[PDB]
Write a protein that binds this ligand. Structure first.
Ligand SMILES: [Mg+2]
Ligand SMILES: [Mg+2]
Ligand SMILES: [Mg+2]
Ligand SMILES: [Mg+2]
Ligand SMILES: [Mg+2]
Ligand SMILES: [Mg+2]
Ligand SMILES: [Mg+2]
Ligand SMILES: [Mg+2]
Length: 44
RNA sequence: ACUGAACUCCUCACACCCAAUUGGACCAAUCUAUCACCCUAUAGAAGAACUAAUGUUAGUAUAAGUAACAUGAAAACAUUCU
């Protein structure tokens, strides 16, 4: 099982590494900007 | 016969010019948790960034040193005159 030793190939897994899993939460878009929102949920 | 453009070719480098709406990836600053020690990495947040709403608080221009405004005269400030 190469997993544990492959992990041993790095420094100590400190608190600086606990990443949310990619696909954890979709981006919290503030309803604005040049791309997502110009009228923010109501239209003209 | 030329001159005449993002049409096209010419050499690089090409996924870099609609309307809403939707869908994905990055980040301005701050706080926190570990890092780090001239502005820093990665994560959880969240009152999270403005050329404007006939917005409001402070400052300050302009119109401008303009529009408008006051002390009867004289005299040693005794007093006289109008
Ligand atoms: Mg072309
Ligand atoms: Mg288009
Ligand atoms: Mg940045
Ligand atoms: Mg905000
Ligand atoms: Mg402003
Ligand atoms: Mg204003
Ligand atoms: Mg004038
Ligand atoms: Mg005058």
């Amino acid at each position: 099982a190469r997993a544990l030793d492959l992990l041993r190939g790095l420094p100590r897994v400190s608190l600086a590494n606990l990443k949310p899993n990619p696909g954890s939460k979709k981006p919290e878009r503030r309803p604005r900007g040049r791309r997502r929102g110009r009228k923010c949920g109501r239209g003209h």
